[PDB]
Every structure is written in structure tokens, then in C-alpha cells.
Design a protein around this ligand. Structure first.
Ligand code: ZN
Ligand code: ZN
Lengths: 119, 117
């Protein structure tokens, strides 16, 4: 005959269907920096060059990504960006570390070595 | 030097972060009809007997399930049940075809032979 179904049975017999929150999973093949910036941002200007430099000094070893929050509002919004710049240090495994505000080449490297490269 | 990212590139190279990856992964070993019904539902009354009949005529080839929306609110709610009866035809792969409103032995068999098998 016809079979009667509880939500419980439904999960086992039809579909385990709830859209469970996705766990953080980095897809890059190298550690990376993610720099959320804007053009009306002050420090971001004195920092951009410092970044370009580190992108060479650690070329081959890390990626440095920049995101213009104005050109990508959905993304910035999805990630609760507030202080500018907002800087992300993303390792090949584990949660990103997030630093609200500007940093010096020294402090940056500190995070690049200690966090991106598990030094 | 530094690489700029769009959101779409972000999804490729950083994290595919949104909850938009969920895939319908049917769990049965045979195609199935899922019938949503309720006691307050008139047309259902004449749809039930048919379904039972079809359960036999097609035994072994398909399962026919019945869900009582009154006793399973979350299920109804979660799937955006608009009215009763709603009927699902669930292939072994691919998304369920959903039809609202009652049906006929002929129409059902139609969906059962074409869509399920
Ligand atoms: Zn979003
Ligand atoms: Zn739910």
C-alpha cells in the first residue's frame, strides 16, 4: 500500500534536506592576504605600495588580493566589513585572522610569516 | 603584484561562501511519489483510493509516500507548500516535479511512466 511519512523518516528515506550553514573552506593553493579597501580611504593609500612590495618579496609563496568595497558591496556586506581598510590573513587551513585598520610592513610581515606560513 | 577580486572571482579563488551549494540528493533506491495531504482536504478524499490502487499496480517499481501536513508543519513550511493537495514526483536523479491540485489515475500513471521511469 501507500507508506506514511514523518519528517524524521523523510530525512532518511527521501532527502536530508536542511540547508546547513557552510563551513569555512579556503580554495586557494597558497595562503593569501585579502585587503578590503576604499578610494576615499587615507591609510589605504600609504599602504597600497607597501602591499605591492610584499607581493614581490613573497611572490610564489603567497597571494595578495585586494577588494574595492565600493565596487563589490554584496561581498563587503556578506562579510560585515566596517573599518577601512579591513585586512584578512587566510591560511591554507583554519579560520582567517582579521585586522581592523592599517598596518606597517613590519606588522604585516609579522602576520604573513607567523600566520600565513605557520612559521 | 597584487590581484583585485570580484565577488565571482572570490567564489572561485577564496571561498564559495554562500549557502547556495545545497544539492537535492534523493535517498531512495526507487523513484517515488510524495503526496502531501490533510484531513481538511476535500479532493484528497477521492485521490487517496486511487493512490493506494497505484501502490499495487506499481509495487516494486516505485514507492508512494503520504505526508500529513497537519502533523508535520516544519516539512510543509520548509517546502513552501502553497495548498493541498500538493504531489511530488521524485526521479532517481534530478529535481522533483511538483504539481499542485488533485489528479487522475490517468494523469498520475502519465507522470509515473514518463517522469519516474
Ligand atoms: Zn550573500
Ligand atoms: Zn526545517
Amino acid at each position: 500500500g501507500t507508506i506514511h511519512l514523518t519528517r524524521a523518516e523523510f530525512l532518511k528515506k527521501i532527502a536530508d534536506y536542511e540547508n546547513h550553514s557552510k563551513e569555512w573552506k579556503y580554495l586557494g593553493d597558497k595562503p593569501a592576504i585579502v585587503d578590503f579597501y576604499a578610494d576615499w580611504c587615507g591609510p589605504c593609500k600609504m599602504v597600497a605600495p607597501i602591499l605591492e612590495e610584499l607581493s614581490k618579496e613573497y611572490a610564489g609563496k603567497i597571494y595578495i588580493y585586494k577588494v574595492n568595497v565600493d565596487k563589490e558591496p554584496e561581498l563587503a556586506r556578506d562579510f560585515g566589513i566596517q573599518g577601512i581598510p579591513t585586512i584578512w590573513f587566510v591560511p591554507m587551513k583554519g579560520e582567517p585572522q582579521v585586522n581592523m585598520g592599517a598596518l606597517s610592513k613590519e606588522q604585516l610581515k609579522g602576520y604573513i610569516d607567523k600566520v600565513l606560513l605557520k612559521q
